[PDB]
């Protein structure tokens, strides 16, 4: 009388890597491009 094994509930897909600061950096460059393009006119 030993509770038999149980099937692994399932998989809950969840993926997180290095986006935060990589895209914040990406942004800081576009802003400066915009400023320069504005300045030229």
């Amino acid at each position: 009388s030993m509770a038999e094994d149980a099937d692994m509930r399932n998989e809950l897909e969840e993926m997180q890597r290095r986006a935060d600061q990589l895209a914040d950096e990406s942004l800081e460059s576009t802003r400066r491009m915009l400023q320069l393009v504005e300045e030229s006119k």
Partner: protein
């Protein structure tokens, strides 16, 4: 390209004592893949895609499986060792099973009728092929895998380039649906070898070692084969290995340190003495006999103190001869009865030993202390089932009265054991074999009243000591009291009658012997007088 390897040869296989089984397996599995495909197509048949094997441990199943797997000039056979396809994630077990057959399906759909050949080995098929419950509330632990396997082996799609093989020890537990002629058709049993089989096995496991002069001329292979009776396959190899090890150990030494001789190791030889030694105390057969039980039951031997012992032995020999050389009566039983302490078990054991049968087993209550009736029934069933696997057998039931759990008060006893024994004393063995059963008891009237004497075919009587002359003869044979005291004791006992069993006589002698040197006879006489007769 031929299916069989170009250089394959039967003698290289290294198998002995299974010629007929191998021939039949070949005939039923591969005969259709040898002649050109035109005739096979004309006959419009389909090749078999299943095999099965079973038997007692140590008979050469895995060896045959591996040999048949290697016999084909095709891809390398896959393998599965018991529950090696189970998984915890949902549905992965079925995907694992399906992955096995993917290559065969791709081959079939691609190349058609000239496709290749594939093999698989579901070793320990019994582990994950238990019978389906077929009832709500009894959900099986492995049911989806069984259903997937059944669907894949023969389902909505057809295959003709596959072959499955199984091996197990319990052929009565495999799922019923997995044994019809469409999935697993050819099934065979592997049993204990015979004399010629043992000779062949010993010859194959010795040919190589004879190549480099490692056998003296004292080894008589035929004598060794005849001596060893009803030995499983593995035990011959075990005996040979142990003999080689013990022979080699003599040249080497050690104790305090480890060293090896270099001037004697080049004259190594193995003789019959080491073989004998090991045969005696190295390998203990499983379906045979050994002297330990006889030494335990014949502790004080047998002494011929009169006529009845000879008549009893002659009757036993006659019954043994009848069972051995008869065909209309393959089941004969004899019941030994007598007063308590008359020494009846020893005579039964002596008859069983002298019978000279390959297989002898003694079922006694000594090993069943405290058991429940179900355990006793199971043990008896197992023993009798084991006794059905030999061309000659003999079983001895000891102390029936104590087996039934009898007690005069009430009286009380166990009905189930009595019913089992009654049904089990009329079951004829499988056709073509023989059996012999010997019983014992100390209360004949009880059994006669329970309607049990109509199951036994005969009956013998074992009497006690009846006259002073036989008591004197037994005393002289034992050799405890010398002539001087013998005269005095005889002068008393000669003029009367006695009633004692030999075991009680031994105990009385032992008890008397503890007194002073010149007080033994008087106390012995007093004890004998106090014993009484009680006819």
């Amino acid at each position: 390209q031929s299916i069989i390897n170009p250089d394959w040869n039967f003698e290289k296989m290294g198998i002995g004592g299974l010629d007929k089984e191998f021939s039949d397996i070949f005939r039923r599995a591969f005969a259709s893949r040898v002649f050109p495909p035109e005739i096979v197509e004309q006959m419009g048949c389909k090749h078999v895609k299943g095999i099965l094997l079973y038997g007692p441990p140590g008979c050469g199943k895995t060896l045959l499986a591996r040999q048949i797997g290697k016999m084909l000039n095709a891809r390398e056979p896959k393998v599965v060792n018991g529950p090696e396809i189970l998984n915890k994630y949902v549905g992965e077990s079925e995907a694992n099973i399906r992955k096995l057959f993917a290559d065969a399906e791709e081959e079939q759909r691609r190349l058609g009728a000239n496709s290749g050949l594939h093999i698989i080995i579901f070793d320990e098929i019994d582990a994950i092929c238990k019978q389906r419950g077929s009832m709500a509330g009894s959900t099986g632990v492995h049911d989806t895998v069984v259903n997937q396997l059944l669907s894949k082996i023969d389902g909505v799609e057809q295959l003709n380039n596959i072959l499955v093989i199984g091996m197990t020890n319990r052929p009565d537990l495999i799922d019923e649906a997995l044994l019809r002629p469409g999935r697993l058709e050819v099934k065979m049993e592997i049993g204990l070898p015979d004399e010629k089989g043992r000779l062949q096995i010993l010859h194959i496991h010795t040919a190589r070692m004879r190549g480099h002069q490692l056998l003296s001329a004292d080894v008589d292979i035929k004598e060794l084969a005849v001596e060893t009776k009803n030995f499983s396959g593995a035990e011959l190899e075990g005996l040979v290995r142990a003999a080689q090890s013990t022979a080699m150990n003599r040249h080497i030494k050690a104790s305090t340190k480890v060293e090896v001789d270099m001037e004697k190791a080049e004259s190594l030889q193995v003789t019959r003495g080491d073989f004998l030694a090991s045969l005696e105390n190295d390998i203990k057969p499983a379906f045979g006999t050994n002297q330990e039980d006889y030494a335990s039951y014949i502790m004080n031997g047998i002494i011929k103190w009169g006529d009845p012992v000879t008549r009893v032995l002659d009757d036993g020999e006659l019954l043994v001869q009848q069972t051995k050389n008869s065909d209309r009566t393959p089941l004969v039983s004899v019941l030994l009865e007598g007063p308590p302490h008359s020494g009846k078990t020893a005579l039964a054991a002596k008859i069983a030993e002298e019978s000279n049968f390959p297989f002898i087993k003694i079922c006694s209550p000594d090993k069943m202390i405290g058991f429940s009736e179900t355990a006793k029934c199971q043990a008896m069933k197992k023993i009798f089932d084991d006794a059905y696997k030999s061309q000659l057998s003999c079983v001895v039931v000891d102390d029936i009265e104590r087996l039934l759990d009898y007690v005069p008060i009430g009286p009380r006893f166990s009905n189930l054991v009595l019913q089992a024994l009654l049904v089990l004393l009329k079951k004829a063995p499988p056709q073509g074999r023989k059996l012999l059963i010997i019983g014992t008891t100390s209360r004949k009237d009880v059994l006669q009243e329970m309607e049990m004497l109509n199951a036994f075919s005969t009956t013998i009587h074992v009497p006690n000591i009846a006259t002073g002359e036989q008591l004197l003869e037994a005393l002289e044979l034992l050799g405890n009291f010398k002539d001087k005291e013998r005269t005095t004791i005889a002068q008393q006992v000669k003029g009367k009658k006695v009633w004692i069993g030999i075991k009680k006589l031994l105990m009385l002698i032992e008890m008397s012997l503890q007194m002073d040197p010149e007080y033994r006879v008087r106390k012995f006489l007093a004890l004998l007088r106090e014993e009484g007769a009680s006819p």
